[PDB]
């Protein structure tokens, strides 16, 4: 799929139990490769995928150095936002950031994004032109001014997303192709679980697939039963792949009238 590199920071203030919690994690597509928890005994950014454990100490030390400095920056953001909203030091509060890049062909950035959140709601957001900011309340307009006068968007965020981000996505891709480019189609199947005299639940399965994207669709002899279909949210297996199912309650027998169809990448046919 349209490849992506993305990072997720989560900053949470623990009052007055000492220092703020911080967690950063990296994803190439739907595969996690790095993490940093400011509570781990290591004090280090760590790998989460095998294919990145080849990168040298310069990487990790380079990475560890950087994400400690980000953590301090967020720690102070907690008390600035607490100040903007007239909130007390007694409350716990959360700051969230996500930034990253979708790869275009020819080694081009296709789309850059970077976006913050305070206490679950939006705050500030880099717009798609990589120059402007969207500020969702008075507070974040204070934040906006400061980053307009500094050129944060075009000078440091545009630049990062248009080169480092892109180049490094292509580096994780190449260094991990045996996994991040392997088509993994869903082992797919149906099961029936009766309900009464009339009824019987048909449940179409789809396990062990990558990436998470998928569609499971029941047809009533040609016609999509959506939205009479119970479709559970795509969920992790634990081994790097995913699983989903959709269920439809049918009058027995009349289930020969029913068929399930699965669209996914790993069902490639040229």
């Amino acid at each position: 799929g349209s490849h992506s590199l993305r990072y997720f920071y989560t900053s949470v203030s623990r009052p007055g139990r000492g220092d703020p919690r911080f967690i950063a994690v990296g994803y190439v597509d739907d595969t996690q490769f790095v993490r940093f928890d400011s509570d781990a005994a290591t004090g280090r950014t760590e790998p989460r995928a095998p294919w990145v454990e080849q990168e040298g100490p310069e990487y990790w030390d380079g990475e560890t150095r950087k994400v400690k400095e980000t953590a301090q920056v967020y720690r102070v953001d907690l008390d600035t936002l607490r100040g903007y909203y007239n909130q007390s030091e007694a409350g716990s509060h959360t700051i969230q950031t996500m930034y990253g890049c979708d790869l275009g062909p020819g080694g081009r950035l296709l789309r850059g994004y970077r976006q913050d959140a305070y206490d679950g709601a939006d705050y500030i957001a880099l717009n798609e032109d990589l120059r402007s900011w969207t500020a969702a309340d008075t507070a974040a307009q204070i934040t906006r001014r400061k980053w307009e006068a500094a050129g944060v968007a075009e000078l440091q965020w545009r630049n990062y997303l248009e080169t480092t981000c892109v180049e490094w996505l292509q580096r994780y891709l190449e260094m991990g192709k045996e996994t991040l480019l392997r088509a993994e189609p869903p082992s797919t199947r149906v099961t029936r679980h009766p309900i009464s005299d009339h009824e019987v639940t048909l449940r179409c399965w789809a396990l062990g697939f990558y990436p998470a994207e998928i569609t499971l669709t029941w047809q009533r002899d040609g016609e999509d039963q959506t939205q009479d279909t119970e479709v559970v949210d795509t969920r992790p297996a634990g081994d790097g792949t995913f699983q989903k199912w959709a269920a439809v309650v049918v009058p027995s027998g009349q289930e020969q009238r029913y068929t399930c169809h699965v669209q996914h990448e790993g069902l490639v046919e040229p």
């Binding site: 950087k66 994400v67 980000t70 920056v73 953001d77 981000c165």
Partner: peptide
């Protein structure tokens, strides 16, 4: 690669 050099809020 992690972004760095963030201007504080």
């Amino acid at each position: 690669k992690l972004f760095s050099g963030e201007l504080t809020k």
